[PDB]
Amino acid sequence: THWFHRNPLKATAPVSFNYYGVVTGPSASKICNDLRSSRARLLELFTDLSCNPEMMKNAADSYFSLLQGFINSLDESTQESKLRYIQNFKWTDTLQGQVPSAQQDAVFELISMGFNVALWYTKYASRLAGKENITEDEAKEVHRSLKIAAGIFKHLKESHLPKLITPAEKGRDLESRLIEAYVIQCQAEAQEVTIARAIELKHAPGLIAALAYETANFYQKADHTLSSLEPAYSAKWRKYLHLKMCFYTAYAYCYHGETLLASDKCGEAIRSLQEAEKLYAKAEALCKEYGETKGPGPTVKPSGHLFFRKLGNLVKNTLEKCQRENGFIYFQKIPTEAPQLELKANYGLVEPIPFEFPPTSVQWTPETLAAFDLTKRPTKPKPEEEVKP
């Protein structure tokens, strides 16, 4: 089964959307109720394990299309809503623990709620993927859910983060590097699911080696993207990314050795299988060095036993072939260095499923908007705590 590290959900303070004298009419009054109720419905779903992607999408759709009114102009989008700065929103971050952050900007709310929705997908994905009984359709759903999340993250970063007036801090969820790492991670993870399948269905070793390799690179990339953060909060996560890089590079060498073998090349085949097992042991090292490190999110232990059942066969096949040359044991002449993997995976690479927010609600009409009279203006709650497992 699959093991994916998860940082905690973002938490927020409840918003009543109650503007009092400012709201002069029934239509404007109704929207505030819709916002209040749809935001709350969405927030409670994050902690509902019985919730599925159809339900999550419908709630997000509701809230976001309403929320859009505080941001976009009615049909004139490319023109900005007068309501944007009306409300202060308060959100915590995945790596900052219970320390909240506030902006009176509807865009800050949109992006932060978006993030959580994307987070929810990767978490729906990881729970479903932790199943030992996992079926093919569940794996598609895992694979697909991770692609949704990737696309959302990407959309937030590309089309949204630039709109914020005040820049977010290093180590905060809405910052290019941090979002970029979430995007990359999601793709890596989807590919993990593809690899386990390519392995089940007995696809060509060269296919599986390239895919494993590229996946190791994604993890490297993500790790590098995060290297810019402060070790305190990024440590455990990075340890886990480094772990995953090794785990999958081993796979690359193992399956790439089978390539080299079928190529009548022995010494490098053996040197490749050796690199694999060495790497795989190095991954066991980093694995509980990761179990030590204190950081955001519960620590995760890999169930998968496969690597050795594969390597044993390869090792046994290689020795049969490469004895009377290099083997039987005490090998020569084996190349001092591991053969450098340069591999492109033509199959199994994952693209983010392109995301866009729903259009501004039909409920937002000029009259309804006019019924918010900002000339009628003259304490704070705290984030309700996410409270997961």
Binding site: K140, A198, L201, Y347
Partner: peptide, 17 residues
Amino acid sequence: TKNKDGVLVDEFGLPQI
């Protein structure tokens, strides 16, 4: 369905075999 090179591919992007 098919990928860009015209080869049959499953939902995961793997060739069909």
